[PDB]
Design a protein around this ligand. Structure first.
Ligand SMILES: O=C(Nc1nccs1)[C@@H](c1cc(F)ccc1O)N1Cc2ccccc2C1=O
Length: 267
């Protein structure tokens, strides 16, 4: 439930997974005080600019992150306060889903792929229920705990291609706007990590959306599935399918993946 405050001694950071302007992420081992067991963890350290106002804002968000409780939604285990701010999240061994599909493109299966979409939709629904807008749904932001299990992280805090036209044009973010991002995320999985609008300038993208052009239907997927992706990118936000609704369609599709999705040779 609550977010633990962690003593510096409690955890050690083994290696650095990623570097960002906002913060640098590390892979680490955390041993809870009073517990024999050692847990692998992902640690994020804010790069700079600590401010009293900033610290309060950061803390406030941290509590909510800790509060979230869903199987497909990442939860912030704890925060460590010292000179720098570090956020502790349980490590996902596999890494980002986008990276996973990219190096495992040859061996992936439709059932796994269809199942991932359902899981993301389920995760998204919890956020909608909790009145949280992710604001940056992407393939990278989906973490692979295991092939069978996937989770969503970094919600609640630009990626022009991923974001909805409404958001781009008027800086408007809503759950429906997140659905447009969700459709793009599905496209990434379907296309095995191909970058959307590859070689296209960010500035141009808004005009293209206005023109009705959309990302190309993936070779692997069936016609019905492509329609779901298109629905997400439709201009009317209300017209776009609800997340709860999305779960049902994918789940039905999940039962017989081969019909809906055709890739290589599969059972
Ligand atoms: O912790 C996060 N990412 C990490 N990378 C390596 C280890 S944790 C990320 C986050 C974690 C989570 F469980 C769920 C949603 C999230 O958005 N958060 C949370 C938070 C709170 C206050 C200020 C900044 C951040 C921030 O960046």
């Amino acid at each position: 439930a609550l977010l633990r405050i962690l003593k510096e001694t409690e955890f050690k950071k083994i290696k650095v997974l990623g570097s960002g302007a906002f913060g640098t992420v590390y892979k680490g081992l955390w041993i809870p005080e009073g517990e024999k067991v050692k847990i692998p963890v992902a640690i994020k350290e804010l790069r700079e600019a600590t401010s009293p106002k900033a610290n309060k804002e950061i803390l406030d968000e941290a509590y909510v992150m800790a509060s979230v409780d869903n199987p497909h939604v990442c939860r912030l285990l704890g925060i460590c306060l010292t000179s720098t701010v570090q956020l502790i999240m349980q490590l996902m061994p596999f890494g980002s889903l986008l990276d996973y599909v990219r190096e495992h493109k040859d061996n992936i299966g439709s059932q796994y792929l269809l199942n991932w979409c359902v899981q993301i939709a389920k995760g998204m629904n919890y956020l909608e229920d909790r009145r949280l807008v992710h604001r940056d749904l992407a393939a990278r932001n989906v973490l692979v705990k295991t092939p069978q299990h996937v989770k969503i992280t970094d919600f609640g805090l630009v990626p022009i291609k991923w974001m909805a036209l409404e958001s781009i044009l008027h800086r408007i973010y809503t759950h429906q706007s997140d659905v447009w991002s969700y459709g793009v995320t599905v496209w990434e999985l379907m296309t095995f990590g191909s970058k959307p609008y590859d070689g296209i300038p960010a500035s141009e993208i808004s005009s293209i959306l206005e023109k009705g052009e959309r990302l190309p239907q993936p070779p692997i997927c069936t016609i019905d599935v492509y329609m779901i992706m298109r629905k997400c990118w439709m201009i009317d936000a209300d017209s776009r399918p609800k997340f709860r609704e999305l779960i049902i369609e994918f789940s039905k599709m999940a039962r017989d993946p081969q019909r809906y999705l055709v890739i290589q040779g599969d059972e």
